[PDB]
Amino acid sequence: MSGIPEITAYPLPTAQQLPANLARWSLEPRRAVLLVHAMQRYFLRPLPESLRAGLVANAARLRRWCVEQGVQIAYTAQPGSMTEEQRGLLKDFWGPGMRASPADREVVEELAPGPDDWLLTKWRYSAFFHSDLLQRMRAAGRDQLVLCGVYAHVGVLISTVDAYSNDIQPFLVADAIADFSEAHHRMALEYAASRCAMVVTTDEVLE
Amino acid sequence: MSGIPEITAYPLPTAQQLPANLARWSLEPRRAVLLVHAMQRYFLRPLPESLRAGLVANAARLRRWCVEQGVQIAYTAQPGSMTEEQRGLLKDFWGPGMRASPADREVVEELAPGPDDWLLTKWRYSAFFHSDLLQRMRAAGRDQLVLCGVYAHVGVLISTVDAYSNDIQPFLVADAIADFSEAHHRMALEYAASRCAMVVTTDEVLE
Numbered sequence: 178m179s180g181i182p183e184i185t186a187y188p189l190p191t192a193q194q195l196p197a198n199l200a201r202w203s204l205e206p207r208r209a210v211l212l213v214h215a216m217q218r219y220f221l222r223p224l225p226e227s228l229r230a231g232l233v234a235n236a237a238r239l240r241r242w243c244v245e246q247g248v249q250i251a252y253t254a255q256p257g258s259m260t261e262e263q264r265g266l267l268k269d270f271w272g273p274g275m276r277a278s279p280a281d282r283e284v285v286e287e288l289a290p291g292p293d294d295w296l297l298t299k300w301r302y303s304a305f306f307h308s309d310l311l312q313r314m315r316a317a318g319r320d321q322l323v324l325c326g327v328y329a330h331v332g333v334l335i336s337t338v339d340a341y342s343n344d345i346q347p348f349l350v351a352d353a354i355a356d357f358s359e360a361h362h363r364m365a366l367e368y369a370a371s372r373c374a375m376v377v378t379t380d381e382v383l384e
Numbered sequence: 385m386s387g388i389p390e391i392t393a394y395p396l397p398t399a400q401q402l403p404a405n406l407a408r409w410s411l412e413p414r415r416a417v418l419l420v421h422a423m424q425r426y427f428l429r430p431l432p433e434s435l436r437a438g439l440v441a442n443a444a445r446l447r448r449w450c451v452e453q454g455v456q457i458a459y460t461a462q463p464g465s466m467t468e469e470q471r472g473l474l475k476d477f478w479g480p481g482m483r484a485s486p487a488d489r490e491v492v493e494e495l496a497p498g499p500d501d502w503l504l505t506k507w508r509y510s511a512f513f514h515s516d517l518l519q520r521m522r523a524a525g526r527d528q529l530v531l532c533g534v535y536a537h538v539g540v541l542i543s544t545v546d547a548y549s550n551d552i553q554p555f556l557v558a559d560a561i562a563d564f565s566e567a568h569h570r571m572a573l574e575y576a577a578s579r580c581a582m583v584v585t586t587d588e589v590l591e
């Protein structure tokens with residue numbers, strides 16, 4: 178009862194297909210965190226292999242640049258086997274959710290965390306919710322957030338909104354996210370570019 | 385430089401045009417708060433009069449039922465004349481924002497707050513952000529939230545998401561909200577019904 182629908186293959190958007198950004202922010206490595214959002218085996222299994230492959234190749238490219246440039250890396254991941262109390266109203270849309278087993282909860286090996294990277298717990302749509310993401314960013318002097326991962330219109334977008342709300346400038350990497358469908362993905366970008374982030378492609382980040 | 389686009393008249397959705405709810409929550413007055421979200425003069429002036437009139441008539445109907453049934457009423461409102469620091473990244477999409485003058489910041493008279501109603505400050509998209517909404521709901525023993533107001537896809541939706549995330553069951557009143565366009569409004573409902581709320585009409589609440 179995952180609540181996650183059948184996902185049909187679609188192309189990741191190119192720079193030419195992105196909506197116009199209304200903001201004018203510019204990414205500075207020294208100010209930034211890369212949020213690798215919910216790239217757990219359980220959340221990537223629903224993706225068709227072509228989409229999975231495109232997503233993980235770009236996120237990996239992105240992560241390597243970030244490490245080379247001194248961008249702080251952060252992963253969010255659900256603990257798995259949430260208690261009823263922990264699960265709360267996620268139950269109603271998404272069932273009991275993934276198990277606390279390596280097969281479900283592991284970050285996929287192509288994005289394997291390194292010793293210096295932050296490991297944050299995901300409870301709800303926003304990566305900041307009941308995590309110490311905000312506190313860590315403040316204590317690290319980092320006020321920009323680069324987002325990649327899944328699902329574009331759900332946790333990725335809501336995390337973007339929350340960062341924005343905390344006066345943290347977000348950069349949503351349009352082809353290093355994936356979603357339930359092309360339309361969901363496109364609408365997440367449209368929302369971001371006009372309401373809370375700079376929408377960019379992986380190449381655009383790498384310059 | 386409000387950032388608010390020209391809004392063209394459109395009909396509020398009827399029960400038959402609503403997306404299917406995936407949740408099964410049921411509103412109990414004793415558990416609930418009615419959030420009258422950003423119904424300030426400044427935010428309603430961009431609406432064409434037909435849309436304004438439909439919105440305020442349904443919100444008023446809703447508020448009267450809520451009072452008759454013992455539902456706690458709460459208003460959110462921006463202080464106006466935000467400092468640069470207070471305004472933060474809202475500046476980039478929405479300019480300096482409304483003034484701290486009655487002409488901008490007042491709740492519209494058709495929804496005039498009463499002495500028992502909560503007055504909460506709005507800073508960002510989510511009504512909970514830097515307000516004491518959550519704290520008050522917890523201390524009042526209320527764990528359901530009925531939302532009306534503007535703009536459907538921005539603060540109304542993000543507030544709905546935040547309530548949901550705090551295991552507070554939301555009820556989004558589809559024809560007691562308004563938005564930048566019909567498509568924005570419809571997509572907010574689609575999002576809500578499948579991700580964070582029961583979507584209902586004013587009549588459906590009044591039974």
Ligand SMILES: CCCCCCCCO[C@@H]1O[C@H](CO)[C@@H](O)[C@H](O)[C@H]1O
Pocket residue numbers: 182330357361364365366368403571572574575578
């Ligand atoms: C910016 C993001 C915009 C998303 C607009 C609608 C998002 C919710 O879309 C929902 O997806 C479900 C499949 O998961 C469908 O079954 C629902 O009918 C549909 O409304």
Ligand SMILES: CCCCCCCCO[C@@H]1O[C@H](CO)[C@@H](O)[C@H](O)[C@H]1O
Pocket residue numbers: 196364365367368371389537564568571572573575
């Ligand atoms: C669930 C809510 C879905 C909204 C999908 C897109 C929302 C943002 O829509 C934006 O509205 C602007 C006018 O304000 C347009 O100028 C932008 O081009 C458009 O992308």
Ligand SMILES: C=C(O[C@H]1C=CC=C(C(=O)O)[C@@H]1O)C(=O)O
Pocket residue numbers: 179180215220267271272273274275301302303327328329331332333
């Ligand atoms: C990958 C996300 O997880 C959520 C979305 C679908 C299923 C979930 C679950 O089973 O818990 C999440 O709540 C995200 O927030 O985008």
Ligand SMILES: C=C(O[C@H]1C=CC=C(C(=O)O)[C@@H]1O)C(=O)O
Pocket residue numbers: 386387422427474478479480481482508509510534535536538539540
């Ligand atoms: C009515 C809202 O205010 C926001 C939306 C547009 C302009 C705003 C402003 O000028 O501050 C808000 O940030 C809402 O969150 O939906």
